[PDB]
Design a protein around this nucleic acid. Sequence first.
DNA 1: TGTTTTGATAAGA
DNA 2: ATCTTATCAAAAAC
Length: 47
Amino acid sequence: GRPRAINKHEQEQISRLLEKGHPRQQLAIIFGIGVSTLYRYFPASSI
DNA sequence: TGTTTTGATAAGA
DNA sequence: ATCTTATCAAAAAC
């Protein structure tokens, strides 16, 4: 199958970043991934 | 040419 | 304008 966009290390990082209030929009641009991908890994209801 | 995850996208009592 | 969610066509890898 297709590889994941973010490995576990990046996941754990990105998690904290969002809990610190970083907009998914920016995070997506920086990590080179879709914005909707971010909502799937970390739902708004999960922060 | 054949069988997992990405990312646009539409809809949101 | 904005923000969120689940969907579904197809990229990505072998």
